[PDB]
C-alpha cells in the first residue's frame, strides 16, 4: 500500500516512502560491510551501476536495515542516471522482481524527478551529485537523449581538488578519513564567486574572505581563495586537467541540441538539483553566464530551491504517490509475461 522511493546515488542512497517530504534513510552507497556499517567500494560509479552484487547488498540494506520493510509488500520506484544503458535497466528490473519479489516497480530518470519536484514537466535540469553531473533537457517528462550532456566532474572531484590545493600549501590530505575531513570543509566553507578574477583579487587584498577550520589533531587551518577556487572547477574544468567545457557551456550546448521551438521554455526553466549545486552563489553565477551566452532578449530563470540536495528523491515521492501514476507501475504479472525488457515499454 505505501510505495517505496529509492534514489541510488554514486555517493548517497536516499530512500523512503512515497508521499513523505524527505527520505527517511540517507546513507553512503558503499560496501566494506554495508552503508553506515573488506577498503571501501562504491558500486555506483559516476551514476551507473558497476557492481551488481554489491548493489544488491545496498538494496537489501535499504529495505531490511534502513526502512524496515519487506520489498515484496510495496511498489518500488527506483531512480537511474540519464543515458543509463538499456542492459542496466533490464538488470535492475530483473533483480527487483526475481530477487526482491516486488509487486510492482518503476524506474525514473533522476533529473526528470527533480524537474517534477519543482512543479514542472518541461525544462532543463543541471543535476550535480557526488560522481556525475548532467544537463538534461526535458519535454513533457521525456528526457531528450540526443541533447543530454554528461560530465564526470562532481562533488567527489571537487573534494579531491580541494585536498590537492590544500596539500600544496603543506596541509596533507590523502587518506580516506582525510578525504572526509576535506568534504566537510568544502560543504561548510566553499562558495561560487560571481566573478572569479575579481574574487581572486579580494582574497589577496584583505583577510575578509577568510575562514578557519579546526582539524582532528587540533591544528586550525585557514582558507581563503580556496573557498571559491574549489567549485570554480565546475565552470573551469581545466583546473583538474579536464578538457570539457564548464557547466554553463554545457547547459548552452544542451539547449542548442534541442529544437529552437522549445528553447524559450528551457531558458526560462533551468532547475538545479543535487548536493553539488548547494554552493552559495552558484545560481547567480549560472544566471550570469547563461545570460552572456543566450540571445539578447531571452528570458533566463534559474530555479535552485533550498531543498535541492534531495529534490530527485522528493520528485520520486510525489510521482509514486499520485493517483494518476497508479496505472504506470510495471506489475509483477507484466514482468512474468514480458520479462526484463518490459522496462523499456513502461519507463
Amino acid at each position: 500500500t505505501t510505495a517505496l522511493v529509492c534514489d541510488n546515488g554514486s555517493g548517497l542512497v536516499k530512500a523512503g516512502f512515497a508521499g513523505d517530504d524527505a527520505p527517511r534513510a540517507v546513507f553512503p552507497s558503499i560496501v566494506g560491510r554495508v552503508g553506515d556499517e573488506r577498503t571501501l567500494k562504491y558500486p555506483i560509479e559516476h551514476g551507473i551501476i558497476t557492481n551488481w552484487d554489491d548493489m544488491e547488498k545496498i538494496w537489501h540494506h535499504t529495505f531490511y536495515n534502513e526502512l524496515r520493510v519487506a520489498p515484496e509488500e510495496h511498489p518500488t520506484l527506483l531512480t537511474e542516471a540519464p543515458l543509463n544503458p538499456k542492459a542496466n535497466r533490464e538488470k535492475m528490473t530483473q533483480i527487483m522482481f526475481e530477487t526482491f519479489n516486488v509487486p510492482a516497480m518503476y524506474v525514473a530518470i533522476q533529473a526528470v524527478l527533480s524537474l517534477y519536484a519543482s512543479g514542472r514537466t518541461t525544462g532543463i535540469v543541471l543535476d550535480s551529485g557526488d560522481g556525475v553531473t548532467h544537463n538534461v533537457p526535458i519535454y513533457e517528462g521525456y528526457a531528450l537523449p540526443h541533447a543530454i550532456m554528461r560530465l564526470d566532474l562532481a562533488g567527489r572531484d571537487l573534494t579531491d581538488y580541494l585536498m590537492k590545493i590544500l596539500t600544496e600549501r603543506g596541509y596533507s590530505f590523502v587518506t580516506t578519513a582525510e578525504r572526509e575531513i576535506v568534504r566537510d570543509i568544502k560543504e561548510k566553507l566553499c562558495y561560487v564567486a560571481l566573478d572569479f578574477e575579481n574574487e581572486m583579487a579580494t582574497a589577496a587584498s584583505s583577510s575578509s574572505l577568510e575562514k578557519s577550520y579546526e582539524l582532528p589533531d587540533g591544528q586550525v587551518i585557514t582558507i581563503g581563495n580556496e573557498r571559491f577556487r574549489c567549485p570554480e572547477t565546475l565552470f573551469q574544468p581545466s583546473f583538474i586537467g579536464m578538457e570539457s567545457a564548464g557547466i554553463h557551456e554545457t547547459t548552452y550546448n544542451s539547449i542548442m541540441k534541442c529544437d529552437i521551438d522549445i528553447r524559450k521554455d528551457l531558458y526560462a526553466n533551468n532547475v538545479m538539483s543535487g548536493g553539488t549545486t548547494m554552493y552559495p552563489g552558484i545560481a547567480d553565477r549560472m544566471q550570469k553566464e547563461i545570460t552572456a551566452l543566450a540571445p539578447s532578449t531571452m528570458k533566463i530563470k534559474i530555479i535552485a530551491p533550498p531543498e535541492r540536495k534531495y529534490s530527485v528523491w522528493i520528485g520520486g515521492s510525489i510521482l509514486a504517490s499520485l493517483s494518476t501514476f497508479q496505472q504506470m507501475w510495471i506489475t509483477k504479472q507484466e514482468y512474468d509475461e514480458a520479462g526484463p525488457s518490459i522496462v523499456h515499454r513502461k519507463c
Partner: peptide
C-alpha cells in the same frame, strides 16, 4: 486527455507531502 497527460497535469498541480 490521455492517462499520461492527466499525470503531467497532476505533477504541475503539485501536492502536500507528509512531514517525517
Amino acid at each position: 486527455p490521455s492517462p499520461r497527460e492527466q499525470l503531467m497535469e497532476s505533477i504541475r498541480k503539485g501536492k502536500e507531502l507528509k512531514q517525517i
